[PDB]
Amino acid sequence: IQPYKPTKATIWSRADALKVNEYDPTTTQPLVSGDFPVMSDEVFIWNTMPLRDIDGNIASVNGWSVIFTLTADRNPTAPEYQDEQGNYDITLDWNDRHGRAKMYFWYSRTGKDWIIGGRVMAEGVSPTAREWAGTPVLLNERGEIDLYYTAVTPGATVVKVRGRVVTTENGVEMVGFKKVKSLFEADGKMYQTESQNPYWAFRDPCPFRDPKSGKLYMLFEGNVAGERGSHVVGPDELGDVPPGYEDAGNSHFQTGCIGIAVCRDEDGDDWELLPPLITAVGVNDQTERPHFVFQDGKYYLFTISHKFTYGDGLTGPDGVYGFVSENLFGPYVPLNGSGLVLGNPPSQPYQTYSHYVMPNGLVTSFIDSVPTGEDSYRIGGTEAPTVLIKLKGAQTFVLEEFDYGYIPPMIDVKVEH
Numbered sequence: 001i002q003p004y005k006p007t008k009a010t011i012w013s014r015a016d017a018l019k020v021n022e023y024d025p026t027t028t029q030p031l032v033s034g035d036f037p038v039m040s041d042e043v044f045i046w047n048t049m050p051l052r053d054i055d056g057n058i059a060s061v062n063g064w065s066v067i068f069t070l071t072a073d074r075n076p077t078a079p080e081y082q083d084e085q086g087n088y089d090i091t092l093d094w095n096d097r098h099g100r101a102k103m104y105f106w107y108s109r110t111g112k113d114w115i116i117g118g119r120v121m122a123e124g125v126s127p128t129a130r131e132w133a134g135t136p137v138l139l140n141e142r143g144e145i146d147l148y149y150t151a152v153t154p155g156a157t158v159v160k161v162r163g164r165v166v167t168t169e170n171g172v173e174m175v176g177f178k179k180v181k182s183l184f185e186a187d188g189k190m191y192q193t194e195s196q197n198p199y200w201a202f203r204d205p206c207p208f209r210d211p212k213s214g215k216l217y218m219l220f221e222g223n224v225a226g227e228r229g230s231h232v233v234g235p236d237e238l239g240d241v242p243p244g245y246e247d248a249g250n251s252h253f254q255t256g257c258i259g260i261a262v263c264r265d266e267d268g269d270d271w272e273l274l275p276p277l278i279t280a281v282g283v284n285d286q287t288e289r290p291h292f293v294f295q296d297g298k299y300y301l302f303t304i305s306h307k308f309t310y311g312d313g314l315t316g317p318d319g320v321y322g323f324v325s326e327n328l329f330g331p332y333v334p335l336n337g338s339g340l341v342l343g344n345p346p347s348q349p350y351q352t353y354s355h356y357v358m359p360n361g362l363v364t365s366f367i368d369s370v371p372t373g374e375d376s377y378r379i380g381g382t383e384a385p386t387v388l389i390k391l392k393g394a395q396t397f398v399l400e401e402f403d404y405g406y407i408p409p410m411i412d413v414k415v416e417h
């Protein structure tokens, strides 16, 4: 026997979070311009999910780049959104997007200047009221796609639906996305359930083939199992805090984690829940959109979070956080010492969200709210400038800003059926 250290969750501790620097130019997203363009006058988009293979390669099909988006109608004539002076209030319409979210696709031969394709699933196919985020996995040269996503209301369930991409020289269609398959939901012993917490998270599936083992796994956002308010911020969750920083306040209410599941097959059909990879009890309630970059034989695990979901006595920016390990199952250490990879600038703290770090170092995000004066701001619901980062050991560095919604392919796949 060669003994191995057992697998354990990596704790993102309060002491790690005290290192978060909101004023580091190497980990700050470039300022979004108040004059940003808007990709649709009919729909809002936000969370953007590039088509990719199971290994994480961003994929074009017959030269066409393809993105999936969470999407909501714009409702400029809705009486519910007219203010006291009878004028449309975009903020109310934008805030209601989550309750009416659906998957759309878009396409382009340039990786930008996206052409709208419309809804992925026809009316009546989705079993739930909302479609929340996931991953569109291109399977083969027949153009078959498994769309892994979150079916929300009733419950929050990781699901998948099989369909096919078809291209012509004029554009792209998504066909046959007809049968949604339940994969798993929160269990209550490892991941928190709605019964334990009405505000539980269980979302954002990110399937991948492990480059070392070749086995199929899947990341997702969850909360650490247990009744809301029952968790304890003990010595390990506090970590090595300095003198005067021992008070955890009511931070036991913040219980985010990055979960992982394993597949029993190569087809992503039958999944088993594993214990969490990263836990943030006392630190942040929302470790959203977990995803990997594999580089230099290491595992770079990114997650998106909010200023507002930090534990009592802690703060940091909205944006990208992340961790690195030599091994899929850890131990992970926080990137840049704190975990912060790409924070919104404090002057425009909500300019972007739902970032996605691609293996080529490009980070795509959508525009949320951009200030245009002392009291005034613009709503986006459209793609932000892409920005290049470099991963180097346990450091990251912001390098270069690219065009709005720039998502170039890493591979092209020849599709015929």
Ligand SMILES: OC[C@H]1O[C@@](CO)(O[C@H]2O[C@H](CO)[C@@H](O)[C@H](O)[C@H]2O)[C@@H](O)[C@@H]1O
Pocket (backbone or CB within 6 Å): 046, 047, 070, 097, 098, 101, 132, 133, 134, 150, 203, 204, 286, 288, 289, 353, 354
């Ligand atoms: O629209 C749901 C989708 O959005 C993400 C990121 O944009 O999470 C956002 O929406 C959640 C539901 O309202 C919020 O709880 C969360 O705070 C917010 O960031 C995804 O994580 C999710 O699939």
